[PDB]
C-alpha cells in the first residue's frame, strides 16, 4: 500500500513495480539462492512510447512475470534492457527477454563473464565504458563505469531528468551490515569506485541500491562505510 516492497513481502515469483519519479520505477522481485530468499531491485525508464529495462527480476520466471506486471501498470513495450553485470539478478531471465522483442545489451566484459560462469548473455556489446569513469548515453539514461565494485563490470546508471541514480549492486541500502554477496568483488577498489560516483553525480535526488530500499545520497557513503569495514 505505498511503501516500498521489502523481501518478506513478495513471493517468489512475483514482481511489483514502485514510482520513483515521472517516467521512472523500481521493479522488485525475490529470488532462492542457497536456501535463502533475498529480494533485488531493477530499473524502468520510459523512452517516449517504449521503455527502456534495466537488469533483470532474476530468473526467467521472475522476468516474465516482471513483462506481465509492466504491461499492466504501464502498457508500453520493452525494446531494450541493460545489465548491469553478469550475476543472475542482473542477466537471469535475458533469455526470456530476447524471446519477447527485447534486444539485450551489456558490456563486454559483463557478456565474457556471464558466458565463462554459465549465465545468460545480453546480445549487443556496450563500448565505450571500458575505463572507470566512463560514460556513454543509452536512451534516456547515462550509464557510468566507476571502477570494480561489487564486481569488475558493475555499471551504475543515471536518469539525468529525474536525478535518479541506480548504482545496482555496487551500491547498498542504508540497513545493510556488509557488503552483501563479495564473491566477485574488490573490496580495496569498491571506495574508490563509490567516491567516483559521487563526484560524478552530486545532484542525484535518488539513489536505487541493488538491492533493498532506495534513499538518498548517503547511500554512497554507507556504501564505502560497509564495505571498508567488512574489507577490515
Ligand atoms: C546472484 C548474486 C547474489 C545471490 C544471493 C545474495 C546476493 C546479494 C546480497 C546478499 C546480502 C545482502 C544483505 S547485506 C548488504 O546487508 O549483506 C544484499 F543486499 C545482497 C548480492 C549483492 O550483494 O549484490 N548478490 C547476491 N550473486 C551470486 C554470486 C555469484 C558469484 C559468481 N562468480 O555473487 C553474487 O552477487
Ligand atoms: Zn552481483
Ligand atoms: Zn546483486
Redesign the pocket.
Known amino acids: 500500500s505505498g511503501e516500498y516492497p521489502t523481501v518478506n513481502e513478495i513471493p517468489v515469483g512475483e514482481v511489483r513495480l514502485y514510482q520513483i519519479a515521472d517516467g521512472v520505477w523500481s521493479h522488485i522481485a525475490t529470488q532462492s539462492?542457497?536456501g535463502?530468499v533475498?529480494p533485488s531491485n531493477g530499473l524502468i525508464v520510459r523512452d517516449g512510447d517504449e521503455l527502456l529495462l534495466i537488469d533483470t527480476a532474476?530468473g526467467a520466471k521472475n522476468t516474465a512475470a516482471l513483462l506481465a506486471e509492466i504491461e499492466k501498470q504501464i502498457g508500453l513495450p520493452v525494446t531494450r534492457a541493460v545489465s548491469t553485470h553478469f550475476?543472475?539478478?542482473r542477466v537471469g531471465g535475458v533469455d526470456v527477454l530476447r524471446a519477447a522483442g527485447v534486444a539485450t545489451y551489456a558490456s563486454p566484459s559483463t557478456r565474457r563473464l556471464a558466458e565463462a560462469?554459465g549465465n545468460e548473455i545480453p546480445t549487443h556489446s556496450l563500448e565505450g565504458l571500458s575505463s572507470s569513469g566512463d560514460a556513454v548515453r543509452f536512451g534516456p539514461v547515462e550509464l557510468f563505469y566507476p571502477g570494480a565494485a561489487?564486481?569488475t563490470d558493475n555499471l551504475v546508471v543515471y536518469v539525468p531528468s529525474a536525478n535518479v541514480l541506480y548504482g545496482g549492486?555496487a551500491v547498498?541500502?542504508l540497513?545493510?551490515?556488509?557488503?552483501?554477496?563479495?564473491?566477485?568483488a574488490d573490496l580495496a577498489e569498491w571506495p574508490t569506485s563509490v567516491e567516483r560516483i559521487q563526484k560524478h553525480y552530486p545532484e542525484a535526488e535518488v539513489v536505487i541500491?541493488?538491492?533493498?530500499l532506495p534513499g538518498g545520497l548517503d547511500l554512497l557513503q554507507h556504501t564505502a562505510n560497509?564495505v571498508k569495514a567488512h574489507k577490515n
Not at 540497513?175 to 566477485?184: E, H, L, Q, Y
Not at 541500491?209 to 533493498?212: A, T
Request: aromatic share 10%; proline share 3%; charged share 20%.
Open positions: 539462492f542457497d535463502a533475498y532474476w550475476h543472475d539478478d560462469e561489487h564486481s549492486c547498498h541500502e540497513s545493510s551490515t556488509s557488503a552483501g554477496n563479495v564473491a566477485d541500491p541493488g538491492h533493498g560497509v
